[PDB]
């Protein structure tokens, strides 16, 4: 054997986590210290020295299994979370206890109730806010009785300080709708009203011992349905009394929003007494930022009309998925935020509190991904400028007083193994951890930002590097192709000892939704790794029209027309890959999950002749079935006067006849609250009505993730069988 | 050329019938056009033309003529609900005046309609209430006012009575001359509801949630009340008074079912009741009282049918056939040795004398006259799968004549019958083993009148096709005969090895081995794919005595499962079977057994298909399930409910390839049952195949769905058997 690499990355390796990626997950507490787990240690960023903060043996004497913990800003208390029951993507329920660190014992008086929906410390000190039964409660001291803020909370109808289904999944990517002011004086919150929002009902089968299935009911607005309404409040937590009910000052939306349906899309405190709100019209091409000041003598809030900021688009929607968040200066009279410039690229605009015109501090044919830190002299941000590779990510430092003075902080640190960065800054940005994902093994490092120099390697994944040495791994090839003189990027997971003169089977792995990017420099140990390493399949992905991080010309091209250009662009990509000479074009497949599944289906249903088989997992089948926020963002309204015509023309069903030429596998979890089972039940019924044979698989009580341990392994195995079969692999 | 899948799916080769409805004692109607036929001469005059209702505007689903021949009821806007229940719109056509009635019409969405046995009285059910029309044009009298959707059912059955007790939707029973209307009332107030999604048309944005009161095993059952109203005295001024007939004391002590309703005379009615523990039933004889207007059922006229080894009746206690004076009746009961035979009863006497004997069974009493009782049984040649018509001389029980045995003994061994109003004539229908044969006979001398349908059309076409053949036979297990049948590929060679598919029902009182001629999926598999399709009636199967039928009492998922495995083993030792390629497939109970077999880890089968299978007995209804299992409680039979689940055998599915199929709108076997099978396979990491059918019910019966499922299964099987 002469020590040559003979083992490959098998499906068992993938499903059983044989080759694990180490992460260095930390959480800052001061400007120079952070916490890390092994045990819980406080690490000193300056010297590297660490002392055990909390011994792993301290909560042995407890009684319950602890899911997570949260130390208070002042480090005097720790919140212990147990009895975790998942709800949707972000939401959950849990019991909480509070351990006093200075007394070294559990608070037994005035306990946080069972079935708490959300709990949060103030940014400083140890105030506590939580939601239980859809109502907000505040504890000024962990061991004292809590003041009740709201009294209107009602299951599925009124949500105080937590989000409803749609706001959670599509707007805030969070269950939480509470925001403390910087020093914990104020507590801003949203209230959602789902009174007339229609219910999605579906069976939940539960344990085998449940005799009668459960019907799950969720207020869920499908495209065009009645949306939930939103109200916003601020309460002063320092003027609470155990005798009068707490007074919550309502901040109303600007007049231009109240005119019709709207959303609250962003909350950001500017200072201790100034808060910024962003609102969005249901037709999501117009948004208004309000800046509101606390009035001393009256105790209310005022958003002066002269400080309003309008962001809008003529070619699409506003923001990548919502309007970008402002980053304020210490005085709160200025802010920085990412918006698209004249040539349609997203860049950092510098705004003054009460002037309409902002000046662009970054320029170019690339985009700023996010503003990560702001100090007195520098602003830190992540972008894909380096070598003009949209699929890359680096940290940049821009001088506030000289816009020509831009330094790349990460570009050249490790040019070959590191081209995809994310960052974690200390409380005042004195230190930061850098996180590199690819194209090589993930690497974690710590830095001093004063001189920009590495202090030490946090995690280098050498234990994994050891194991990979003997393994025939795949390679990635990230490159591009010209189409209508526009550059379009693709990535290919290529099998070991790749021969360009040989013909390989090809799997097109697609997402292709608005602002997607499936062509990047990230290192992954996934299903594709196996298919390449073990089965000698090339797994490609392509970013056609509608994909993000390369300007609005590309991203907005699909505006109001989902299921058109991006679908055709995937098809075209496959024609292109064939023309590279190393693809067996009688063995070309396509798969995808969510939007990816929709595109897969539209492609297999298009009678193009290019694809032999495909897998759709939890796909949308028709847009009137999916939620309003996401769908209307790109499709407008499903009404005759708006966009009904394209809603009606862009379904999977009406292409059922075409599936007679392809082998189709269709997978869906019965308890999918996101993309409802309904959607696959309509595809299956259409394929039956035209007499088309297909393969199928439902996952009892699985949701959109099909993410449970056993279900995950079973679907990937099932898909691997289907693919090997379609490609004639033994 | 062979019989193909397309052949079966698109019905290229059609079995012709001869469906008739006796109108009098020498006349019957026959669809074409609708003709009246004389049983004597065979001449026919048209009753109504093909398109007499050309200007009707509605699509006519079914016609129904009144007994006095004066009015025809027309049915349209037919909307199927469950197996037997449906909704419809109606119109009444005056045959004399040649025009539709337009005043006081029958409402839209009527649940049930029926003429009285004589004349033209007409009762219907609408919004769970009973109405009566004396005359087609006159207003209707409202009988009941308590009808409430999903809660109270007057004159119609709820889900469990429709499916498992009466095999019908109607709970209405006219007396023989129409004076009385007897009806049942069902109360579903505390019966839990099965809920499931209905997705409907693509244009429905939010799925429908269907909810049906449906008692699963050991749950709260509907309650029942029995009433009788006098239709001859109906005031349009005062509310109609309904006389309740309460169940006997021996039944009121606990949960019970009304299982049979039979009029004896113009003033005497019999009711059979069954304890929820279905091994005890009581028959009441109730007499109308004149100078009081009530109904009386003496404790001395009660008859008790019970069983120590099992449940009572095949599926329900048998129905009684009364003499004209109604002082005597005949009904099928199991004898001392466990075989079902006819007992003769006296209304007054506790004892009954058996009039038939032997190691075979009476299938049913067909007609009772002054001097003869006619019945069907499987006695001919000791074949439990045969059916012949028998005449028994009432003055002397030893004089028994087989009326169908020798008519055409090669092609005909399975007969059903249809006697005219007074049994003057009868139509014999022969279902196999050759092509079906329909003949008319005179009962005064048993002589044949004529052949009605001989299927010589089909016979011609079938001459051009390489058809399979059928072998019916038995094997001996523990000194007992167990019957099996086999569909054999054409030009069958004993010295060749064939893939074999076991077709399984195997539920209690099932019979899958018989002489019937069938054109079905199995026919295609034997014709085109060269697969033997075998069936086998092991323990728990019917028409062979209690000893075999009651064997699985309280033990579903055991002996009947073990016996399907042994059958396959016996089939292996027959020499012409490739034991590397044996499969099993089954629908309903058929699916439950198929899954149990595949999960047994016997090593016998490579693969199997389970369509809409029961997965565990607590998921299934009370009536059927508790008939065999008792109650799922710790003091009764909880342990065996917990032992007989498909889920518990999930580990063994690693040895087989499994295809698991279910309609999502199945009201009978809830998708629940298959959802739990798959969860279990998932939890132990077994790869299997699945297919759901959106909005299909237990039948998966829609044109396209039907063609889809059979096509999908053919692929699975061809793949399992390495067939191109
Ligand atoms: C949530 O919103 C609903 C309607 O979206 C509110 O219900 C309305 O209340 C108004 C004013 O009292 C009444 O005119 C109607 O009875 C309701 N409208 C309709 C047509 O449903 C409800 O008050 C709101 N709940 C809260 C506490 O904010
Ligand atoms: C704080 O507000 C709550 C909720 O409105 C008050 O509780 C209700 O008071 C109203 C009338 O004032 C009564 O009709 C209800 O019976 C009360 N409902 C309950 C118990 O939630 C509460 O009293 C207020 N607290 C004070 C004293 O200011
Ligand atoms: C159907 O059965 C239900 C359930 O037993 C009966 O409802 C009861 O009626 C009595 C008298 O009206 C009440 O005191 C009880 O509260 C009821 N029980 C429940 C839980 O509903 C009802 O009488 C029956 N209805 C008919 C028309 O027969
Ligand atoms: C026949 O009986 C029914 C039900 O008992 C009567 O209908 C109800 O009559 C009572 C008063 O007798 C009212 O309080 C109810 O509201 C009625 N129910 C409805 C809406 O149908 C009916 O009136 C009686 N009819 C005759 C002919 O006496
Ligand atoms: N989730 C989801 C989802 C479902 C149906 C259609 C489109 C989407 C958008 N989406 C998202 N999200 C994008 C918007 C924010 C969240 N809803 C998650 N993540 C991954 C894929 Br693949 C995808 O298609
Ligand atoms: N139907 C049904 C059904 C469902 C689950 C278990 C057992 C049955 C009984 N059954 C019936 N019925 C038997 C009893 C009367 C009706 N319920 C229909 N017909 C055909 C097959 Br195969 C079968 O398994
Ligand atoms: C690190 O070392 C210093 C030495 O002065 C010590 O005092 C300190 O406690 C250590 N830091 C932490 C946070 O453990
Ligand atoms: C939470 O639930 C547990 C167990 O049901 C109970 O013992 C505990 O006291 C509860 N916590 C409180 C007091 O809210
Ligand atoms: C936080 O800010 C508020 C409002 O400006 C101020 O009144 C309060 O004193 C501050 N908190 C502390 C303790 O500094
Ligand atoms: C927003 O969208 C609608 C419909 O696409 C369009 O008519 C309108 O002009 C847009 N508004 C703005 C401010 O561009
Ligand atoms: C049949 O013909 C006879 C006379 O030959 C006649 O009396 C009878 O009415 C006819 N019946 C029918 C229904 O055609
Ligand atoms: C049945 O319904 C239709 C349309 O809804 C109506 O026109 C017709 O008259 C109805 N028939 C009766 C008898 O009510
Ligand atoms: C039917 O029987 C009843 C009750 O015995 C009797 O009064 C009546 O005469 C009969 N009806 C007719 C019209 O034959
Ligand atoms: C009927 O019910 C059960 C059957 O398990 C049994 O205990 C009881 O003895 C039976 N009754 C009779 C007398 O058959």
Cα separation of B437 and B542, whole Å? 26
Q: Is A648 helix (H, G, I), strand (E, B) or coil?
A: helix
Give B431-490 as a 3 state SS string: EEECCCEEEEEECCCCCEEEEEECCHHHHHHHHCCECCEEEEEEEEECCEEEEEEEEECC
Residue A305 DSSP symbol: G
Please state, in angstroms and as integers, the Cα–Cα distance from residue A263 to each residue in A266, A315, A634, A675, following that order: 9, 20, 16, 22
**First and final C-alpha spacing in chain A:** 24
Provide the CA A238 distance to its chain's centre, in angstroms. Answer: 35
Angle at A41 between CA A37 and CA A45, to 5 degrees: 105
Cα separation of B328 and B353, whole Å? 12
- As to burial, measured by CB atoms within 10 angstroms (0-12 exposed, 13-18 middle, 19+ buried), residue B484 is buried
Compute the distance from residue B624 Cα to the ligand 6 centre, in Å: 9
Compute the distance from residue B288 Cα to the ligand 13 centre, in Å: 12
Q: Is B179 in the pocket of ligand 13 (CB under 6 A)?
A: yes
β-sheet bridge partners, residue A400: none
- Taking the CA of A75 as reference, the closest ligand is 7
Q: What is the DSSP string of B102-136?
A: -SSPPPTTB-EEEE-SSTT-EEEEETTEEEEESST
Q: What is the DSSP string of A312-345?
A: E-SSS-SSSSSPPPPEE-TTSSEEEEEEE-TTS-
- Residue A439: asked if its preceding bond is cis (omega within 30°), the reply is yes
CA distance B660 to chain A (A): 10
Which H or E run contains A722?
helix A709-726
Q: Is A191 helix (H, G, I), strand (E, B) or coil?
A: strand
User: CB–CB of A170/A627 below 8 Å?
Assistant: yes
Tell me which residue has its CA closest to atom 2 in ligand 2: A245
Tell me which residue has its CA closest to atom 3 in ligand 11: B43
Whose CA is closest to B562, among B540, B579, B583, B589? B540
Q: With beta carbons under 8 A apart, name residues in chain B contacting A684.
A: 692-694
Please give the order of strands across the beta sheet that includes A378-383. A368-374, A378-383, A394-399, A406-408
Q: Is A151 in the pocket of ligand 2 (CB under 6 A)?
A: yes
Which H or E run contains B562?
helix B559-572
Helices (H) and strands (E) in chain B, counts: 12, 44
Cα separation of A397 and B423, whole Å? 104
- Resolution, angstroms, 1 dp: 2.5
From B117, B232, B263, mutation site for ligand 13 pocket: most ligand atoms within 8 A of C-beta: B232
Cα separation of B100 and B137, whole Å? 10
Give the active site residue among A91, A334, A594, A621.
Answer: A594
Q: Is A245 in the pocket of ligand 2 (CB under 6 A)?
A: yes
Q: With beta carbons under 8 A apart, name residues in chain B contacting A676.
A: 207
Cα separation of B625 and B637, whole Å? 12
Q: Is B108 in the pocket of ligand 12 (CB under 6 A)?
A: yes
Q: With beta carbons under 8 A apart, name residues in chain B contacting A622.
A: 202
Helices (H) and strands (E) in chain A, counts: 12, 46
- Which of B205, B664, B712 comes nearest A222 by C-beta? B205
Domains and their CATH numbers in chain A: 1-472 (2.140.10.30), 473-730 (3.40.50.1820)
Cα separation of B618 and B632, whole Å? 7
User: CB–CB of A97/A114 below 8 Å?
Assistant: no
Rg (alpha carbons) of chain A, rounded to whole number: 27
- How, if at all, do strands A613-617 and A583-593 pair? parallel
Please state, in angstroms and as integers, the Cα–Cα distance from residue B480 to each residue in A510, B545, B548, following that order: 63, 12, 9
Q: Give the number of other CB atoms < 10 A from CB of residue B534.
A: 27
CA atoms within 13 Å, Cβ hemisphere of A692: 25
Ligand 2 atom closest to Cα of A148?
1
- As to burial, measured by CB atoms within 10 angstroms (0-12 exposed, 13-18 middle, 19+ buried), residue A88 is middle
CA atoms within 13 Å, Cβ hemisphere of B652: 17
Q: What is the DSSP string of B251-278?
A: HHTS-EEEEEEEE-SSSEEEEEEEESSS
Ligand 7 atom closest to Cα of A50?
14
| Sequence-ordered strand ranges (E) for B51-202 | 62-65, 71-80, 86-94, 99-100, 112-115, 122-126, 129-133, 141-142, 152-154, 172-174, 180-187, 193-198
Cα separation of A355 and A309, whole Å? 9
Residue B617 DSSP symbol: T
User: CB–CB of B586/B609 below 8 Å?
Assistant: yes
Does A201 contact B192 at a Cβ distance shorter than 8 Å? Answer: no
Q: Is A465 helix (H, G, I), strand (E, B) or coil?
A: helix
Tell me which residue has its CA closest to atom 4 in ligand 13: B266
From B278, B279, B313, B629, mutation site for ligand 14 pocket: most ligand atoms within 8 A of C-beta: B279
Cα separation of B318 and B327, whole Å? 18
Q: What is the DSSP string of A483-512?
A: ETTEEEEEEEEEPTT--TTS-EEEEEEE--
Q: What residues contact B77, with CB distance under 8 A and at least 6 apart?
A: B58, B61, B87, B88, B89, B108
Q: Is A113 in the pocket of ligand 8 (CB under 6 A)?
A: yes
Q: Is A241 in the pocket of ligand 2 (CB under 6 A)?
A: no
- As to burial, measured by CB atoms within 10 angstroms (0-12 exposed, 13-18 middle, 19+ buried), residue B638 is middle
The C-alpha torsion from B675 through B676 and B678 to B684, rounded to 10°, is 160
Provide the CA A560 distance to its chain's centre, in angstroms. Answer: 23
Give the active site residue among B7, B91, B666, B695.
Answer: B666
Which H or E run contains A372?
strand A368-374
- Look up A721 and say whether it is catalytic: no
Q: Is A102 in the pocket of ligand 2 (CB under 6 A)?
A: no
Helix A565-578 with A595-604: angle, nearest 10 deg = 70
Give A65-97 as a 3 state SS string: CEEEEEECCCCCEEEEEEEEEECCCCCEEEEEE
Does A696 contact B695 at a Cβ distance shorter than 8 Å? Answer: no
Q: Is B78 in the pocket of ligand 4 (CB under 6 A)?
A: no
Q: With beta carbons under 8 A apart, name residues in chain A contacting B682.
A: 699-700, 710-711, 714
CA distance B554 to chain A (A): 20
- Look up A1 and say whether it is catalytic: no
User: CB–CB of B181/B172 below 8 Å?
Assistant: yes
Compute the distance from residue B212 Cα to the ligand 12 centre, in Å: 27
Ligand 2 atom closest to Cα of A244?
28
Whose CA is closest to B165, among B621, B481, B638? B621
Buried b (16+ CB within 10 A) or exposed e, B188-204: beebeebbbbebbebee
Cα separation of A347 and B520, whole Å? 70
Q: What residues contact B690, with CB distance under 8 A and at least 6 apart?
A: A696, A697, A698, B659, B660, B661, B678
Residue B279 DSSP symbol: S
User: CB–CB of B213/B159 below 8 Å?
Assistant: yes
Q: How was this structure determined?
A: X-ray
Does B207 contact A696 at a Cβ distance shorter than 8 Å? Answer: no
Q: Is B265 in the pocket of ligand 13 (CB under 6 A)?
A: no
- Chains A and B: how many Cβ contacts under 8 Å? 120
Cα separation of A283 and A559, whole Å? 12
Helix A709-726 with B671-683: angle, nearest 10 deg = 90
Helix B589-598 with B559-572: angle, nearest 10 deg = 70
Q: Is B635 helix (H, G, I), strand (E, B) or coil?
A: coil
Q: Is A273 in the pocket of ligand 9 (CB under 6 A)?
A: yes
Cα separation of A316 and A244, whole Å? 49
From B41, B47, B48, mutation site for ligand 11 pocket: most ligand atoms within 8 A of C-beta: B41
Ligand 11 atom closest to Cα of B44?
14
Residue A664 DSSP symbol: E
Residue ranges of the alpha helices (H) in A428-484?
462-468
The C-alpha torsion from B476 through B477 and B478 to B480, rounded to 10°, is -50
Rg (alpha carbons) of chain B, rounded to whole number: 26
Q: What residues contact A438, with CB distance under 8 A and at least 6 apart?
A: A418, A419, A420, A520, A521, A522, A523, A524
- How, if at all, do strands B180-187 and B193-198 pair? unpaired
Q: With beta carbons under 8 A apart, name residues in chain A contacting B199.
A: 678, 681-682, 685
Q: Give the number of other CB atoms < 10 A from CB of residue A646.
A: 17
Compute the distance from residue B241 Cα to the ligand 4 centre, in Å: 14
Interface probe with A: pick from B205, B654, B671, B711, most Cβ of A within 10 Å:
B205
Whose CA is closest to A391, among A489, A276, A466? A489
Q: With beta carbons under 8 A apart, name residues in chain A contacting B712.
A: 693
Q: In terms of CA atoms, which chain A residue is nearest residue B645?
A: A208
- As to burial, measured by CB atoms within 10 angstroms (0-12 exposed, 13-18 middle, 19+ buried), residue A648 is middle
Q: Give the number of other CB atoms < 10 A from CB of residue A484.
A: 6
Cα separation of A687 and B709, whole Å? 12
- Which of A201, A689, A696 comes nearest B692 by C-beta? A696
Q: In terms of CA atoms, which chain A residue is nearest residue B676?
A: A208
Cα separation of B443 and A470, whole Å? 91
Cα separation of A520 and A478, whole Å? 7
Cα separation of A333 and A669, whole Å? 50
Compute the distance from residue B239 Cα to the ligand 4 centre, in Å: 9
Q: Is B266 in the pocket of ligand 13 (CB under 6 A)?
A: yes
Cα separation of B573 and A270, whole Å? 86
Q: Give the number of other CB atoms < 10 A from CB of residue B210.
A: 13
Please state, in angstroms and as integers, the Cα–Cα distance from residue B228 to each residue in A356, B188, B293, B660, following that order: 86, 21, 11, 48
Q: What residues contact A292, with CB distance under 8 A and at least 6 apart?
A: A251, A274, A275, A276, A277, A301, A302, A303
Does A686 contact B202 at a Cβ distance shorter than 8 Å? Answer: yes
- Which of B679, B690, B694 comes nearest A681 by C-beta? B694
- Look up A704 and say whether it is catalytic: yes
User: CB–CB of B4/B464 below 8 Å?
Assistant: no
CA atoms within 13 Å, Cβ hemisphere of B664: 27
Does A203 contact B196 at a Cβ distance shorter than 8 Å? Answer: yes
Q: What residues contact B191, with CB distance under 8 A and at least 6 apart?
A: B158, B213, B214, B215, B219, B220, B221, B222
User: CB–CB of B215/B192 below 8 Å?
Assistant: yes
Please state, in angstroms and as integers, the Cα–Cα distance from residue A326 to each residue in A195, A340, A345, A550, following that order: 32, 14, 18, 22
Q: Give the number of other CB atoms < 10 A from CB of residue A642.
A: 16
Provide the CA A507 distance to its chain's centre, in angstroms. Answer: 25
Q: Give the number of other CB atoms < 10 A from CB of residue B463.
A: 8
| Sequence-ordered strand ranges (E) for B495-598 | 498-504, 532-537, 577-587
């Amino acid at each position: 054997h002469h020590h040559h690499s003979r083992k490959t990355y098998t499906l068992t390796d993938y499903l059983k986590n044989t080759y694990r990626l180490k992460l260095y997950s930390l959480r800052w507490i001061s400007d120079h210290e952070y916490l890390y787990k092994q045990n819980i240690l406080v690490f000193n960023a300056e010297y590297g020295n660490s002392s055990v903060f909390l011994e792993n043996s301290t909560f042995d004497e407890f009684g319950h299994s602890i899911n997570d913990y949260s130390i208070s800003p002042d480090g005097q208390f720790i919140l212990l979370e147990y009895n975790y029951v998942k709800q949707w993507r972000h939401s959950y329920t849990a019991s909480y206890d509070i351990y006093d660190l200075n007394k070294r014992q559990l608070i037994t008086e005035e306990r946080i109730p069972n079935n708490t929906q959300w709990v949060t410390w103030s940014p400083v000190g140890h105030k506590l806010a939580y939601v239980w039964n859809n109502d907000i409660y505040v504890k000024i001291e962990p061991n004292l009785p809590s003041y009740r803020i709201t009294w209107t909370g009602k299951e599925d109808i009124i949500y105080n300080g937590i989000t409803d289904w749609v706001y959670e999944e599509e707007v805030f990517s969070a269950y939480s709708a509470l925001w403390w002011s910087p020093n914990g004086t104020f507590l801003a919150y949203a209230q959602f009203n789902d009174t007339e929002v229609p219910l999605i009902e579906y069976s939940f089968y539960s344990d085998e011992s449940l005799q009668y299935p459960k019907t799950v009911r969720v207020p869920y607005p499908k495209a065009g349905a009645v949306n939930p309404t939103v109200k916003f409040f601020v309460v002063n937590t320092d003027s609470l009394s155990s005798v009068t009910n707490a007074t919550s000052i309502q901040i109303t939306a600007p007049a231009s929003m109240l005119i019709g349906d709207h959303y609250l899309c962003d909350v950001t405190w500017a200072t201790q007494e100034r808060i910024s709100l962003q609102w969005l019209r249901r037709i999501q091409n117009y948004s208004v930022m309000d800046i509101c000041d606390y009035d001393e003598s009256s105790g209310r809030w005022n958003c002066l009309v002269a400080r309003q900021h309008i962001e809008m688009s003529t070619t699409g929607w506003v923001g990548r998925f919502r309007p970008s968040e402002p980053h304020f200066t210490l005085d709160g009279n200025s802010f920085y935020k990412i918006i698209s410039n004249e040539e349609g690229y997203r860049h950092i605009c510098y705004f003054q509190i009460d002037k309409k015109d902002c000046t662009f501090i970054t320029k170019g044919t690339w985009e700023v991904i996010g503003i990560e830190a702001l100090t007195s002299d520098y602003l830190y941000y992540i972008s894909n400028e380096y070598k003009g590779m949209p699929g890359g990510r680096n940290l940049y430092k821009i001088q506030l007083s000289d816009y020509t003075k831009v330094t790349c902080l990460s570009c050249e640190l490790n040019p070959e193994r590191c081209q995809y960065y994310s960052v974690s800054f200390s409380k005042e940005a004195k230190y930061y951890q850098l996180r590199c994902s690819g194209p090589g093994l993930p690497l974690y490092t710590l830095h001093s930002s004063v001189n920009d120099k590495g202090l030490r390697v946090l995690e280098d994944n050498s234990a994994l590097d050891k194991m990979l040495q003997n393994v025939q791994m795949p390679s990635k090839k990230l490159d591009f192709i010209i189409l209508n003189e526009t550059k379009f990027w693709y990535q290919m997971i290529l099998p070991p000892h790749f021969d360009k003169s040989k013909k390989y089977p090809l799997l097109l792995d697609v997402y292709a939704g608005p602002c997607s990017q499936k062509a990047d420099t990230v290192f992954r140990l996934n299903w594709a790794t196996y298919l390449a390493s073990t089965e000698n399949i090339i797994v490609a992905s392509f970013d056609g029209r509608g994909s993000g991080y390369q300007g609005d010309k590309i991203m907005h091209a699909i505006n109001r027309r989902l299921g058109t250009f991006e679908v055709e662009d995937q098809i075209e990509a496959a024609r292109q890959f064939s023309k590279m000479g190393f693809v067996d074009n009688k063995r070309i497949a396509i798969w995808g999950w969510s939007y990816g599944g929709y595109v897969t289906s539209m492609v297999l249903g298009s009678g193009s002749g290019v694809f032999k088989c495909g897998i759709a997992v939890a796909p949308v089948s028709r847009w009137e079935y999916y939620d309003s926020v996401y769908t209307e963002r790109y499709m407008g309204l499903p009404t005759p006067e708006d966009n009904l015509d394209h809603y009606r023309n862009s379904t999977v069903m009406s292409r059922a006849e075409n599936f007679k030429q392809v082998e189709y596998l269709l997978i869906h979890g019965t308890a999918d609250d996101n993309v409802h089972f309904q959607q696959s039940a309509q595809i299956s019924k259409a394929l039956v009505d035209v007499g088309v044979d297909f393969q199928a698989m439902w996952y009892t009580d699985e949701d959109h993730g099909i993410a449970s341990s056993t279900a995950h392994q079973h679907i990937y195995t099932h898909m691997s069988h289907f693919i090997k079969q379609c490609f004639s692999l033994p």
